[PDB]
Write a protein that binds this ligand. Sequence first.
Ligand SMILES: [Mg+2]
Length: 847
Amino acid sequence: MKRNYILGLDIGITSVGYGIIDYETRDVIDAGVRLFKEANVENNEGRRSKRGARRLKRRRRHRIQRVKKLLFDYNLLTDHSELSGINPYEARVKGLSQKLSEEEFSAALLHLAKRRGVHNVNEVEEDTGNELSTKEQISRNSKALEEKYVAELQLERLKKDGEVRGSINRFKTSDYVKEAKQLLKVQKAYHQLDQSFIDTYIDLLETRRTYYEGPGEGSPFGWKDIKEWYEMLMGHCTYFPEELRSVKYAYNADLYNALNDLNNLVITRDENEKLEYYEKFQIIENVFKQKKKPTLKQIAKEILVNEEDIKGYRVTSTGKPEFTNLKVYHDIKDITARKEIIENAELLDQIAKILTIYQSSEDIQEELTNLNSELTQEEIEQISNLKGYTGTHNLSLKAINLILDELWHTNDAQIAIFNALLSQQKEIPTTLVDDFILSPVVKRSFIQSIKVINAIIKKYGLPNDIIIELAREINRNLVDTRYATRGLMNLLRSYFRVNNLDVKVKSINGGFTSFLRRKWKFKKERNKGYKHHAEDALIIANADFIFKETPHQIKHIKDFKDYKYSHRVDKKPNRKLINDTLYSTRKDDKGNTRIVNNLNGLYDKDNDKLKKLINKSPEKLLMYHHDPQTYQKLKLIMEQYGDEKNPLYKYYEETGNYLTKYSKKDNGPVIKKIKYYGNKLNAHLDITDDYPNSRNKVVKLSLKPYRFDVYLDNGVYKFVKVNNLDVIKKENYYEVNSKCYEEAKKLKKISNQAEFIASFYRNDLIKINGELYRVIGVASDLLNAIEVNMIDITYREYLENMNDKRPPRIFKTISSKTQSIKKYSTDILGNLYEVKSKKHPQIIKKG
RNA sequence: GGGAAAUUAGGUGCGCUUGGCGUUUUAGUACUCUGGAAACAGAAUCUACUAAAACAAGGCAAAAUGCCGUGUUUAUCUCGUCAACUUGUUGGCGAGAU
DNA sequence: ATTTGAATAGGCAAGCCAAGCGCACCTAATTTCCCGT
DNA sequence: CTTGCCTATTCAAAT
Ligand SMILES: [Mg+2]
């Protein structure tokens, strides 16, 4: 409306506060908070890490299947071949001397390809008894294999230590290939197999993709070839967008940086203080092309002037004068000093590019040979083994080759030479943040902040001033100096400037607000609720009044009530579906399926889990039923060393021997985990068909919710949970599964004559028996409970300020007792609306 | 006061390539029980090792260093319009209401 | 008068860590340059 | 740290 105002903003990690104030009177108009989930780097790190893991497991499986096909082709494996009881460590060690059977031979080759070592680990030759260090383990093993093969060492441990697998099982692929070559050398005699077989098999075994190949064809994450790969990555020029930067060590790029140094030099001479063309020419030719690292003495001699006269040079942290080093010139000169080659800039830029862009020597050699030069194959092979070619210059070659003559002649700054030689928008576009790169956290707070400003400009018209305060991860250091804060205000100032809108964007320092709170006696406390973020914003906005022209104004701020909250609602499909862990099940005495649990860490000083379990519930142990003799043997220990936390710890401490299974001759194995009956099985995902002939049931737990759809059925409120498992990707859209959905309604006994009321997503707003909350989820589908939270404060904090000691969670049962359920919604500003729903639930979701 | 480049040292993010593990099932062997002079047969499925297989539910693809599946964006409803495939819904744009 | 069912309180558990690579951007120190308060 | 979901405990209503 007509009235003119200021807009405060308190940008935060989870929140954007906003405050709006009359420009004349400084009375509060409005104020509110927009709350969101902190954008944690952990989240995407998770997504990426798991995508990596899925490819590793896919590639192992596909390598095993490529081996099998080769064994089918050379008629060593069939559909009806018994590989079942063939110890491959025996077969590996046997087949390095004697004839294997086709089955033993197939067993062995398949065992090698499954598990084939590292390829990128060099010796450290150090041992500080670190179990988890790959480098230290790889080295300890390298020593063990001086005289023997991996399978020899592996069979030795199987027999001495009783086991092979684990942390000590870390070997180099080259150690495995040495074995395979020997195995195939012996076996070639007795089996019909040829050099094609042997070459093929070792390729399968040793080969893997490189970091600069990346995925195969289909991938959204892939790329066609190395240049595409590098082009995608590298940055763009400042003065000529749509041109990729130069590589750091191109001849013209280093020569550019060389000239700027010399142009900066100031000398106390009778003639001109700055260097002349001829002087610069002879300095470059005699110093920068002769000496690898120019020194001030060597420059001083060429001029024929004392060192102290020359001033205005780059200085190392130590104190030495620093001058640019021509990398490529020297690198190639050192290989071959032919004037045809090393006095040709265009070639020396090409060689540099190739050396930066290509990664392996054998790729560089081809790319140089295709370059069609006067270089010899001997020279090319030396070039291809050069190091340290990375990175980019800030300018493109286009930009450098433009101004190289001006730097040669005039003693000018680069900026001076380049100096010499949004309007269609209605609202602030949110893509502009994406242009410049930020912390994932901050990028989210900012996208929200622009969406919040847009919504105010719409509702109230343009502000006179906008003011900003970011959260920190009488004095005049108020203008905030952080890359993000600068970035934001540059975005905004640009926008208003272009579209010709008189708006004064500003900022103030994080600390400053706190000072005014102390000054005007206004205690900050998260205790109260989310309102603190908003009443930060209103303070910021009143600092604007102080930076133009008090009890009464701050009385308005402090006594103000009509705050507004806008929690963001997540509707994204295909989030995490379920928890990773797998659980076995068992039917107990009463005929109840139960999850099986495990007690690990039995021999730890402060672990009372088993002692608690034995005293409470001895019948929950599976060995209570199944190994009674070992049970009685364990009970005598618990009675012996009752007084301590962990009776078994004393058993290990005093005698120096882990607890073994009962046996007549004292040769039962150690006990290291104990299985016992845990919770009853209700809500689960059944994965038992992945395990053919599993006796019991194999399950996963924590079905994670997508939404719940409320229905009103003959005066009774009811609801369905829709799981994320119930939602399925099609071509360009997700679909809620119809069969799962009608099944779900049937377990809930929801009639065909029942009216759909609403769908509730996470953070959707719900009014239950006249009380408004935000939705968290479905506590129990079966019992018909939904977890909610409060709006203005977390229920945890509501109980703390009360000093109440209940559980800090709200659960609400939806039942015949429930009288009304209504859905509400807020705009981004927190204006609240009772909202209408469609006639049916949503099935398609294009976003 | 703001912006820019170079050098050295560290950090952050996106992406890629690997390795040993871990969870779980089936089998074998050891441990237990029963029978047998013994080999061994059966019972038990508990404790341990080894192999093979699965590991967000799934979806493609078809001999292939094969590919995707946990991130980001995300108040609601109506009308107009363009589009989409699911053929009456849900996306973009615009307008309105809540 | 005792037993059965609802509601509230109480509590448990959730995959991991080591090796390598590209590019981008930030900070700090030092020197120089270009615009202006 | 939060959330999905089970167990156990306490009080009121029905046989
Ligand atoms: Mg705040």
